[PDB]
Amino acid sequence: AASGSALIFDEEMSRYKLLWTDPACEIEVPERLTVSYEALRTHGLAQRCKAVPVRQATEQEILLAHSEEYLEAVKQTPGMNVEELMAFSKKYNDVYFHQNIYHCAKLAAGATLQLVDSVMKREVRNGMALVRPPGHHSQRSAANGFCVFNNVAFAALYAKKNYNLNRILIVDWDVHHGQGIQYCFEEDPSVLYFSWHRYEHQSFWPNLPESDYSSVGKGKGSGFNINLPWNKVGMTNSDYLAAFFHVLLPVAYEFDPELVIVSAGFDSAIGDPEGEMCALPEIFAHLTHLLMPLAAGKMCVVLEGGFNLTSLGQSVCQTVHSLLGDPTPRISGLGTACDSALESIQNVRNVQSSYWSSFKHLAQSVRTVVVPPPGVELTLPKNCQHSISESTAKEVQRIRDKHFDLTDQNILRSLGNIISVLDRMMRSDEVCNGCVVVSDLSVSVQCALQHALTEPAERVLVVYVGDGELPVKTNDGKVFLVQICTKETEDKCVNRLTLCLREGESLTAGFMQALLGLILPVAYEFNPALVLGIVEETAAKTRLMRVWGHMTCLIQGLARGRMLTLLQGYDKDLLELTVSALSGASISPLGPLRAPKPEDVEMMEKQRQRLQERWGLLRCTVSESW
Ligand SMILES: NCCCNCCCCCC(O)(O)C(F)(F)F
Ligand SMILES: [K+]
Ligand SMILES: [K+]
Ligand SMILES: [Zn+2]
């Protein structure tokens, strides 16, 4: 039962710097480290995190990913003067050395191990390490690209040996390719390495053909190395989210990592002189959030790059915000990925399709308000509450007279409860989300949505779980309706998405692929002000409630996390699961998910072809030119 978020940091790692004029290395300054921590303090985030002390990495730990020949060469640098430090730096590609850099490199390595021990010993839920020098360019016998030792490589090897881990996911969202990490795990199918990076047809540093999408791994580890090259600059939020939805996330949940490590470099953020991208710092609150259902939340974030001092702290804060569980900012303006990004996304999916079958194509502190039935007390997490007002009961009496004949007082209580929690979610912002146990489905749902439009909730997303007619139409304001059922139907409207999954053992896999590839792209582009989750009696405790905790966790990326959930009937297990995932707890893994049955893959692709014209964030192929 892990608790909070670790923040490993030490100011000693800022006590090395460039000592000669060297235009390639001028951007790597100690101020990157002090600005990232000071920004965490100004916004009160550091004080909220469990500080963990920085230790040195033992030379046996360093030899996990490096050779004695190179370690002993670095170990001799603290005795060098400046002229000897230049002579040693010139032996390597874009990296300087300092009398103190060997010391700090051992701290950056040990700090990463400290973070691994913290998360793996269930001492913390997750954590971030603010280390310097970076890691992912460092190779077995050479320093490269400001890196001395591969901090992320150690963590994965350290977590393998000392915790007997079989499946580790490494996500490298730094704008540069982490060839050091690729080389280290090239033939290793236990460490899935994903990296997007500014490539520009190999014209951008490090200018390696192995950085291209062709490198899917060697030997038994082929298919466990995924490169996504950005071939043009100016990539935006829609590009990064299309990369997650249609490349990284489908592979990650099938892989089911036992631990997620992140090469977090924020030179992929707007304003950075090296990445020249256009993604806002808020995007990293979502990249983080979309990964947290993996590995029961066990997530280690290690600082890599990020060179614009202003935009850097903003991106660090968004990551720690999400790491602590704060509501994710609403991302607006999302649409289709540019044609270059779609080109790379389409190529990676095809080259990886021989290893991941879902990529194949056909030939051409109050957070949650819990409102259960009367006289049933329950055990609720620390940040959970309970229930009515007269202005509410008056308004419910107004609603009851004008639109309903409604007599039962038990469902008059729920209508007053639904309104009360909705007003606290929007107008007053006290709570984020809530759950209400409901008897009458059609009235509760139709009253909830109609009251939400007056809050005002501009656009509402409605996720319905069950068969039969929906209690809400496509007309009630700006709404997008999503139904998960088993009754085969073919919808016509562009704001409706009906997913008829084929019941059985593979209901778990088809759901997740439909969530990451269809539901989440549309919802993120829709940008709802409120999410309305519904589940009827017929679908409760049944086979598709395995993914429900995952959906209600991932869907909180929309609408600042404001999600009202209406449970029909009463299931103790179900209400337990929704409230936990609404409250921010960790989600139990689903195990290694096989590929869904091709009968569901086809229905999903028919839905994608139907909506990707209107909702361009569904596209994972270049647009056919007209
Ligand atoms: N001909 C001159 C090429 C200079 N290119 C410098 C690229 C440095 C990349 C470092 C980084 O941002 O990946 C890290 F995270 F490691 F800091
Ligand atoms: K990268
Ligand atoms: K690998
Ligand atoms: Zn970088």
Residue numbers in the entry: 1 to 364, 412 to 434, 437 to 453, 455 to 676
Quote the study that presented this structure, word for word.
Therefore, HDAC6 is clearly an acetyllysine deacetylase and HDAC10 is an N8-acetylspermidine deacetylase. In addition, we report the 2.85-Å resolution crystal structure of HDAC10 complexed with a polyamine transition state analogue inhibitor.
This inhibitor binds as a transition state analogue with Ki=0.7±0.2 μM. Interdomain interactions were mediated by α-helices αF and αG, loop LH (which connects αH1 and αH2) and the C-terminal tail of each domain, burying ∼1,700 Å2 surface area. The trifluoroketone moiety of AAT formed a gem-diolate, making asymmetric coordination interactions with Zn2+ (O1-Zn2+ and O2-Zn2+ coordination distances of 2.1 and 2.5 Å, respectively); hydroxyl group O2 also hydrogen bonded with H136 and H137. On one side of the active site, gatekeeper E274 was close (3.7 Å) to the N4 atom of AAT.
